[PDB]
């Protein structure tokens, strides 16, 4: 399925080239521009654990998730991955725990040492 495919066929987008964040572009976005550090980014996403369980979805809340890019307001894999996206792009990210929640995990649903799969849509980005 999609998590296996990004694991085996994804692109390493880390600057360390340690395979910690792998990406596949699923829907090509608009133009060439990617968001800049500090931009307000608006995303829709779904996240799955490596046991197949959905742990989160913004679609199910009928509102996007909004954060300031590159500020550590989200897991490292998202700061790195969203920074590569064009407006309107949909991608898959496969995130090793060192770029996610590490040994701590995140209650209620994310265990220790968890590799995470996300589908992410970059809806918009805006500077301030
Ligand atoms: Na595929
Ligand atoms: Na891209």
UniProtKB/Swiss-Prot annotation:
Report the PTM annotation.
Answer: Acetylation impairs ability to promote interaction between Akt/AKT1 and PHLPP1. Deacetylation by SIRT7 promotes interaction between Akt/AKT1 and PHLPP1, leading to suppress Akt/AKT1 activation.
Give the source's domain of life in one word: Eukaryota
Q: What induces it?
A: By androgen.
Effect after changing residue 16 to Q = Mimics acetylation; impaired interaction with AKT1 and PHLPP1
The record's tissue-specificity note reads:
Widely expressed, enriched in testis compared to other tissues.
Q: Where would you find this protein in the cell?
A: Cytoplasm; Nucleus
Q: Where is the PPIase FKBP-type domain positioned along the sequence?
A: 30-118
Task: Report the residues modified as N6-acetyllysine.
Answer: 16
Briefly state the protein's biological role. Immunophilin protein with PPIase and co-chaperone activities. Component of unligated steroid receptors heterocomplexes through interaction with heat-shock protein 90 (HSP90). Plays a role in the intracellular trafficking of heterooligomeric forms of steroid hormone receptors maintaining the complex into the cytoplasm when unliganded. Acts as a regulator of Akt/AKT1 activity by promoting the interaction between Akt/AKT1 and PHLPP1, thereby enhancing dephosphorylation and subsequent activation of Akt/AKT1.
Assembly, per entry: Part of a heteromultimeric cytoplasmic complex with HSP90AA1, HSPA1A/HSPA1B and steroid receptors. Upon ligand binding dissociates from the complex and FKBP4 takes its place. Interacts with functionally mature heterooligomeric progesterone receptor complexes along with HSP90 and TEBP. Interacts with NR3C1. Interacts with Akt/AKT1 and PHLPP1; enhancing dephosphorylation and subsequent activation of Akt/AKT1. Interacts with IFI44L; this interaction modulates the kinase activity of IKBKB and IKBKE. Interacts with IKBKB and IKBKE.
Q: What is this protein called?
A: Peptidyl-prolyl cis-trans isomerase FKBP5
What is the source species?
Homo sapiens (Human)
This protein's encoding gene: FKBP5
Q: Where the shown chain sits in the full protein?
A: 16 to 140 of 457
């Amino acid at each position: 399925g999609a998590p296996a495919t990004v694991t085996e066929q994804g692109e390493d987008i880390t600057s360390k080239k340690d395979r910690g964040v792998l990406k596949i572009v699923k829907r090509v976005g608009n133009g060439e521009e990617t968001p800049m550090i500090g931009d307000k980014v608006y995303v829709h996403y779904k996240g799955k654990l490596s046991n197949g369980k959905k742990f989160d979805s913004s679609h199910d809340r009928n509102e996007p998730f909004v954060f300031s890019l590159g500020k550590g307001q989200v897991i490292k894999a998202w700061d790195i991955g969203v920074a590569t996206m064009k407006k309107g792009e949909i991608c898959h990210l496969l995130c090793k725990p060192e770029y996610a929640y590490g040994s701590a995990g995140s209650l209620p649903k994310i265990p220790s040492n968890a590799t995470l799969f996300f589908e992410i849509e970059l809806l918009d980005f805006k500077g301030e």
